[PDB]
């Protein structure tokens, strides 16, 4: 291995689609599985935010310093058990955008890449907001990762159609452009991927590793 100084914020969806237990459990437990199994070394730490209709910081980078804090605090931070929210993308984005990056920037006084991991199931109700959110991230040199839930909490046939329908509509109505949602992810480096479950994480980590590298 070799030097890779950076810090990471992980933002986990707390909207209505997370109301199915499969979505919340796998997303939060996996973050916890990773964190617990992870040599969360000096190279970079993890800050975690929850977000629905509004973002909530669950904890700062160095707050749940001990994995034990995570062992108990995942319950402390239980996501809505029966979720009825929407994703206020613009706010969730600006909250972690400003917080994680500013905190990292000041906190460590060093050569740290700013990475944000986005865990959600797809297109947001206000995805149009991306044109500015993207703009801001670009200007500020902020790196992101987008993990797309298969439109969880909707019939599997609908997980597909809900997102493809936006595309289908995009094709006819010249007003519309699905691209704005995928757009936020500059996939040349800031790759995004639709997944079924937590076992696609090794792909992410590995792809991300090369981006962690350089």
From Swiss-Prot:
User: Where found, per UniProt?
Assistant: Nucleus; Nucleus, Nucleolus; Nucleus, Nucleoplasm
* Domain VWFA, first and last residues per copy: 7-209
According to the lineage, what is the superkingdom?
Answer: Eukaryota
- Subunit relationships: Associates with pre-60S ribosomes in the nucleoplasm.
Function of the protein: Nuclear chaperone required for maturation and nuclear export of pre-60S ribosome subunits. Functions at successive maturation steps to remove ribosomal factors at critical transition points, first driving the exit of early pre-60S particles from the nucleolus and then driving late pre-60S particles from the nucleus.
Family designation: Belongs to the midasin family.
- This chain belongs to the protein called Midasin
Gene source species: Schizosaccharomyces pombe (strain 972 / ATCC 24843) (Fission yeast)
Query: In the record, what lineage is assigned to the organism producing the protein?
Result: Eukaryota, Fungi, Dikarya, Ascomycota, Taphrinomycotina
- The full protein's residues present here are 4499 to 4712 of 4717
